[PDB]
């Protein structure tokens, strides 16, 4: 079916976990371990804490975000 559902909200990069996973605190609030986007990985786009990044977030589990855009 492919559901259009996600929230394209931004956030501050709090902390770098392994893989390229980050606890990023959003515009609105809650910090979710957010993993980097595949696209980003492909174009080698690094992130460090102290950044403002676009983070696509799921309806099923609003706890695992996905860092979409290059900052």
């Amino acid at each position: 079916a492919k559901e259009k559902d996600t929230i394209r909200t931004e956030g501050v990069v709090t902390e770098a976990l392994p893989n390229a996973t980050f606890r990023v605190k959003l515009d609105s609030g809650p910090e979710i371990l957010a993993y980097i986007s595949g696209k980003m990985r492909m174009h080698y786009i690094r992130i460090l804490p102290g950044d403002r990044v676009v983070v696509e977030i799921t309806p099923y589990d609003p706890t695992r975000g996905r860092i979409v855009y290059r900052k």
Partner: protein
């Protein structure tokens, strides 16, 4: 530093000084030499810059040794304590940070001044907010052992503080 001893002295009349401080006045150099020989010592020109050169009957080698000892003392009293440096990073985890802190503490105890630089590398823009915060935290942690000699001074791809021991 060093002088002319007995045979090295070529000047004819010299002022003769004793083992402790025996003023023998301006005598001949030969006479002085003879005196030294009698004493089983050596006449050494201690003030070549003085009225018919001032020359002490002494054990020259002994004097030299004494001088050397004094020099050594001076350089051992020059305080071996210096700067220990501890490059931190931006993304430094907790355990590692604590280890670093411990190291710093040890250095302080030893007596050392501590260059507590934060290494930066990539973005180096958000740097002060996080890096500065980290530095502040470090300072807070060492409130009791370390007085901040400095304040965070960004030069290269980094920012350095120095730290000093609280009480000497």
């Amino acid at each position: 530093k060093e002088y002319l001893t007995n045979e090295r002295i070529r000047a004819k009349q010299v002022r003769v000084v004793g083992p402790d401080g025996k003023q023998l006045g301006i005598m001949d150099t030969r006479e002085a030499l003879r005196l030294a020989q009698e004493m089983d010592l050596d006449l050494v020109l201690v003030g070549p810059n003085a009225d018919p050169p001032v020359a002490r009957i002494m054990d020259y080698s002994k004097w030299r040794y004494e001088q050397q000892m004094a020099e050594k003392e001076a350089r051992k009293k020059a305080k071996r304590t210096e700067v220990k440096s501890i490059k931190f990073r931006v993304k430094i985890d907790e355990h590692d940070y604590q280890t670093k802190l411990g190291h710093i503490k040890r250095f302080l105890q030893e007596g050392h001044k501590v260059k507590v630089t934060i290494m930066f590398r990539g973005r180096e823009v958000a740097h002060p907010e996080l890096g500065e915060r980290i530095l502040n935290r470090v300072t807070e942690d060492l409130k009791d052992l370390a007085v901040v000699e400095m304040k965070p001074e960004m030069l290269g791809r980094d920012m350095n503080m120095l730290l000093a021991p609280v009480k000497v």
